[PDB]
Amino acid sequence: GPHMTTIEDEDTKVRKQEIIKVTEQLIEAISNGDFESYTKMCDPGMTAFEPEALGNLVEGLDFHRFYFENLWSRNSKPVHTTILNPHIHLMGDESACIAYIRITQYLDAGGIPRTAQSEETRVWHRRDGKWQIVHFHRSGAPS
Template identity: 70%
Template sequence: MSNKLSARKQEIIKITEQLIEAVNNGDFEAYAKICDPGLTSFEPEGLGNLVEGMDFHRFYFDNLLSKNSKPIHTTILNPHVHMIGDDAACIAYIRLTQFVDLQGHPRSSQSEETRVYESEEEAERSRGGILDKIRGSSEEREVQADVDAGGGAERSLKRFLGSSLSSCALLSHRRSHD
């Protein structure tokens, strides 16, 4: 693997770590800087539904994460980064989260997560400067999820639309095991 490719993959891992750190700290501002305003996700809290936009996530930041005074520590295990051209990437990993429960006991939870990122520069180029007009319109990204019998999921990103600062989480899949 070339040094440039290796550096790009490390950058994706670092951005993912920053995103998780923002979640752990209840820092919606930092989270919003990394994520596209029109991000899509499958989350356990979404009860199997495709969730679009930041409002769903903001609810948890406002009502749970920002009020959590107990320490949370997350470890990313076995990250696999797949570059999609020069300006997009997909990362799949195991997220091991350590926390203190309501009774004061240390606990751990595990989830499998997949995220897709696209650079802002490429998003701007590919849209011919109409980025702000596309955001929030009905012309959002399309995502197809094929769930296998074992409950795992493969995500197929049909197209990219939208972006944020240096990259954006267009798709987040999380399946938890407590």
């Protein structure tokens, strides 16, 4: 279009929104204890670092399934999630990386509104059309 003297290419804008959407979708699946949708979004050889893994690098979805079968009783109180200061890094058409602060507003524990924070890194890989998480790193203490 007009104004050729500059990168009129803002598909990077929509590509990033693409990544933000799948991340939101992933979080919703997690938040609703929907393990099926979750696995659908994760690469089988998915790798992860998270408080629940006590400093160990975990492989597969098997380890996460636990929390999706027991704590699945997730439905016991309201839980609003906010993704702050997102930053996406595009790497090829099949590879993306997103880092953001994850803020969770929940009740319970004494029945009072409380807020939890965690730093998250999600590494995305495009396979046969849909984006899948290949690795993620969570920092803080919340799930």
